């Protein structure tokens, strides 16, 4: 069907799972993955059950095709994939924290792209099972900024006390960045 | 099935948003984006919301799907994208206006590239919340031209009597550029 | 739908308009562009009205997408495009006449290609609002020929007096060209 | 939906015309091209004419749409194309025949390219109104060959007893060429 | 429809014919090629008759398009193609035997690929009208082997006397090849 | 319409076979490949056999169609392919096992390429009839690694308590490789 789904190759499992779920819901097939198992199998629950499996097999790389082996139902393929990739593993949390603490702004990288990278890393770390509050996101974001973005942070700390949200900090940093861009 | 909509990748957000809105209006779906939320929600709303969410997810890039991973309505996905790639900032408006007022046409650059740059600057101005009328756009385009067009510029400002538009001015400037190139 | 329609980029507007009209007529949608406005809007006049607009937006470049702005109906988009491009402008007529008077046959160009170029220039000039008779087309064609195609022109002038049509002149020139090709 | 028909661009008009005629015959449309015009025109004729015009416009190039811009029936578009790219000229027939009779096979050129050139020359002859039978085509192909094939040529002219065709002669010549290449 | 069918260009006619037959059977159209001619033509026998012809014309190269000439029915196109290509010609048999006797195993060619080449050559020779028994296939296969595959052949000759089939010989040679691969 | 199945060309037969089996199971066709042959054959069997044969022919290459040229059932085509590209040979099993036991990870080669090579070797082993459990595969993968992973290897063998699988071991090894690359 839709060719926008990149085949799963062990990287970015959440994106692939979300795309597969959306495509299955498009064809009124997602009820197989998350629904209620009928007591008896009907004709309606005979076509979607194999259509979902065929769609999953279609968007899987050569190495991962062993997840099916022609005997695993469509729901259990995604269950097995979740049990190995969508898992709350401490090693992944440690690796994501190590990568997050190594982020540094560079003159060749725009602020919006850096914010997007930080946001996707935060999303991955949250999907790794760890819980991050609103204040911790700001704390992680401000440590990656260079010495240029210092005084505004103070203006954020002293003045703002209730509206201190990640969106507000991002907006203030984006607004104040042009003052460095024209200053060089 | 409209494949002319390039997936959003952080570049040219206005074009992608306009294409998405037009496609949603095609399928009787735009009513959930603009309007109100009825108290009696039924299939006519659930199906439209599902179609809008599926279309937005399909036409978003893999790295940009983080804006709709959670259970977020179609309106809120577009609102989140608007709050990021269409940020309202007065300082940004002033900086972009200063850049546009100093813009000039170079000899080695054709008129089409200058028109594209001016269009990009105007799109950035409108995205930043600046309210610019079409006459102001025409004036900004005219003041960013060399003296060789000055004559026809007067013919645009004095002799023209109909409802002046940016497209007509651009076509007249292109014709004048062709005449100048033929003369030189 | 059909991908043979090049997106409109301010060049060859007549071809783009004809292709869009043909595609709309293919889907029984062209009645929106040129039809009768009903007193009340029905379900039949609810789908095509937006399908035509979506098709027009689909086959428009990024710069021209401002012609819609989500509030202009499908007929009025083409009306606005006609009012700026499909216009009887004297400047376009002068430019087309200047280009037509500069046509010269070259040894590296075949006679059929030159005839096609002259025909498309004549069609563009006619679409510019000027009226050309049958004799004027022949007069414009014969002035672009080199000194090789002289005597046959005399044979055209002295002998033919009633069947003097553009097709006859083109046929005679094509027949007589091979006499130069083998003569060098 | 038949995409094997290359859009007409002034090259190989016979192939494009044959493909268009076959496609029209597929959709019960060719009846409006060959036949007569009934006095009682109804939907069965209007729909067929519209389908033919739409197909011809779709399979014509952007620069070649000038042949059908006006309200011109499907028969007349093909007639206009025939009068241009299938012009009947006795002098053209004589020139092409003189070129074909002097044609010879070069050592550095394979038999397939020579067959293609001979086919192009024969197509140009038939387009110019020259009436050539299949036996005449076989003779023309045979006389344009070196002496190394002479033996098998005799085997074609003397030993063959069935209805000789150009395809069988071409296959026999290709087999003889393969044998000669193996020998050398 | 399906794009896996390479256009027929005078090479591998059997593959093209089989693919065309399969595609026609896919659309319930193959009954035209091989069926029973009705006494009167009905609406059912009005659409497939031209659909098969259009499909055949669609998958034919430019040179072979003369096989139809708009007057030959779909069955007769394939009949004419068979009468020229699918023919029991002694010259083709001699050429195929000459190529079969020139096969020699090379160190740069694997045994499976050589077996596939020998099998396709045997299939072509059988399609050329000649009849080959099971023993003759083995006799042709063993003559193409080098001096390395000698003793096993003796082990095949002395021991096996009833199960001496082409598949058994191929299996034994493939099993014994690795003993040369590791021996160098 | 599933275009992710690469046509069979003698390489990676297991992947192509698995994809074909999955696609057949999608269309309610796999029942003719696995099961029994009912005495009362009706349309439910003829249509399924025709669909299977058409799909297999379509997804086979042009040179590989020789396996199904004759009137051969869907089961027998797959059986013929199995008897050739999935040959059971004890000597082949021993040779592949000897090659795998001597396999080692080189410094210049990434872990992904080593995993792919190990997967190819395991697929060749399973194709040759060797019965290998998942724990044996995990052990074979672990013994083919340098000493730098030894620590985590022990953490896999001793600390792990759940049902160990090859995918989890591969993910842990990839994480350890990332950690080692970060350290070095």
């Amino acid at each position: 069907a839709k060719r926008n789904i990149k085949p799963f190759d062990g990287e970015k499992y959440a994106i692939w799972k979300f795309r597969i779920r959306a495509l299955l819901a498009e064809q009124d097939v997602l009820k197989v993955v998350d629904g209620l198992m009928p007591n008896e199998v009907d004709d309606s629950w005979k076509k979607a059950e194999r259509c979902a499996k065929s769609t999953i097999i279609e968007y899987l790389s050569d190495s991962f095709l062993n997840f099916a082996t022609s005997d695993i139902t469509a729901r259990q393929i995604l269950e097995n994939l979740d049990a190995v990739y969508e898992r709350k593993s401490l090693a992944s949390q440690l690796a994501l924290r190590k990568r997050l603490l190594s982020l540094k702004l560079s003159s060749e990288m725009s602020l919006l792209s850096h914010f997007h990278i930080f946001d996707e890393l935060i999303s991955e770390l949250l999907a790794a099972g760890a819980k991050i509050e609103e204040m911790d996101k700001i704390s992680h974001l401000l440590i990656t900024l260079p010495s240029c973005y210092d005084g505004i942070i103070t203006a954020i700390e002293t003045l703002s006390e209730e509206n201190l949200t990640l969106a507000f900090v991002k907006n203030r940093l984006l607004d104040q960045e042009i003052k460095i861009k024209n200053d060089h």
Side-chain angles (χ1 to χ4, degrees), chain A:
Chain A
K2 306 190 291 182
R3 302 135 294 281
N4 261 337
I5 294 179
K6 189 176 80 73
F8 181 56
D9 208 344
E11 294 173 8
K12 305 292 181 67
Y13 170 70
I15 307 299
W16 175 91
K17 182 179 173 67
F18 196 45
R19 275 275 157 78
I20 293 298
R21 285 179 79 77
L23 189 150
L24 286 192
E26 203 189 38
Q27 312 163 354
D28 209 333
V29 178
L30 198 59
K31 64 176 183 289
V32 165
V33 175
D34 43 357
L36 193 143
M37 290 299 296
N39 45 0
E40 72 167 50
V41 163
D42 292 346
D43 184 38
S44 77
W45 185 257
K46 187 162 297 297
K47 287 311 289 182
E49 180 60 272
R50 62 199 62 197
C51 188
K53 183 177 178 178
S54 172
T55 289
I56 294 176
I57 291 170
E58 181 80 1
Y59 292 117
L60 276 180
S61 44
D62 293 345
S63 66
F64 290 95
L65 280 170
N66 297 335
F67 269 84
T69 58
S70 76
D71 61 341
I72 293 297
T73 62
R75 180 180 293 173
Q76 303 207 309
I77 303 170
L78 293 184
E79 183 181 2
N80 291 350
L81 277 166
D82 287 333
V84 60
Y85 277 89
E86 199 187 287
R87 190 192 63 228
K88 303 156 47 59
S89 57
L90 189 151
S92 56
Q93 297 198 9
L94 280 189
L96 283 159
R97 285 193 197 279
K98 287 220 153 193
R99 303 169 51 210
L100 193 45
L101 262 67
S102 163
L103 286 181
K104 304 277 144 186
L105 198 68
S106 61
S107 73
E108 289 288 328
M109 206 191 177
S110 54
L111 205 61
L112 277 168
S113 77
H114 175 272
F115 281 175
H116 188 40
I117 295 312
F118 165 79
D119 199 3
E120 70 180 2
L121 271 162
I122 282 290
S123 282
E124 283 201 300
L125 197 150
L126 282 167
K131 286 274 182 33
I132 299 180
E133 283 190 356
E134 194 74 24
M135 179 58 66
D136 216 320
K137 285 178 184 176
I138 304 176
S139 286
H140 276 95
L141 181 49
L142 302 181
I143 203 180
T144 68
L145 302 179
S147 79
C148 306
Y149 301 79
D150 49 6
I152 189 66
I153 282 184
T154 308
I156 286 171
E157 275 164 17
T158 63
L159 279 163
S160 58
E161 84 276 14
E162 291 178 350
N163 206 22
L164 189 48
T165 70
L166 186 50
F168 182 63
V169 181
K170 277 177 178 239
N171 169 40
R172 291 292 326 159
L173 292 167
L174 281 165
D175 204 341
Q176 195 271 333
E177 176 213 8
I178 55 178
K179 300 192 218 167
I180 295 92
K181 282 203 290 183
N182 60 70
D183 199 287
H184 315 86

